[PDB]
Amino acid sequence: KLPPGWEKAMSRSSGRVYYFNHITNASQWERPSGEPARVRCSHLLVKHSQSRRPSSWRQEKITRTKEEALELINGYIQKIKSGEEDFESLASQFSDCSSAKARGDLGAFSRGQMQKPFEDASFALRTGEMSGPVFTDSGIHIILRTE
Numbered sequence: 203k204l205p206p207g208w209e210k211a212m213s214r215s216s217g218r219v220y221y222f223n224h225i226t227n228a229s230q231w232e233r234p235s236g237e238p239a240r241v242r243c244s245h246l247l248v249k250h251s252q253s254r255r256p257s258s259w260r261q262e263k264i265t266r267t268k269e270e271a272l273e274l275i276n277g278y279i280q281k282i283k284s285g286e287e288d289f290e291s292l293a294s295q296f297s298d299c300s301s302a303k304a305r306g307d308l309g310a311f312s313r314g315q316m317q318k319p320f321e322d323a324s325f326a327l328r329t330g331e332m333s334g335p336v337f338t339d340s341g342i343h344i345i346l347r348t349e
């Protein structure tokens with residue numbers, strides 16, 4: 203029926219159907235369109251107190267809760283989708299990863315290099331698409347597939 207990971211869902215507020223991807227946590231009104239050795243992604247990471255290393259270039263000691271981190275991720279997604287903010291600008295300013303200095307770019311990678319939820323979401327994204335919140339031991343990620 204639909205591409206890998208996608209399923210139909212029902213909007214509680216509006217009653218209109220939408221599409222949700224359980225690998226990438228992406229959700230959208232439009233029916234999704236239509237695997238490579240390598241993909242290229244950028245990401246925006248929000249760390250929290252249970253992160254594998256609760257530190258970043260932004261904060262020596264990261265104290266926010268997982269729930270607080272998810273709220274921040276949700277808000278960044280809203281601003282990217284409305285177009286008030288660009289993914290790359292938010293990543294440079296707010297990502298808790300060293301890759302913030304490269305507008306979130308991680309370069310290209312193969313399967314078996316990244317943490318598995320990040321890998322699976324990256325390879326289920328189509329070129330140019332963006333994930334919802336993706337959870338790993340580092341924190342909570344927004345992922346943008348660029349190649």
Ligand SMILES: Cn1ccccc1=O
Pocket residue numbers: 230232233234235
């Ligand atoms: C095809 N399509 C169109 C608009 C937003 C998302 C998407 O996947």
Ligand SMILES: Cn1ccccc1=O
Pocket residue numbers: 245308315316317318320321338
């Ligand atoms: C997202 N990411 C970045 C570096 C190493 C592993 C990983 O999952």
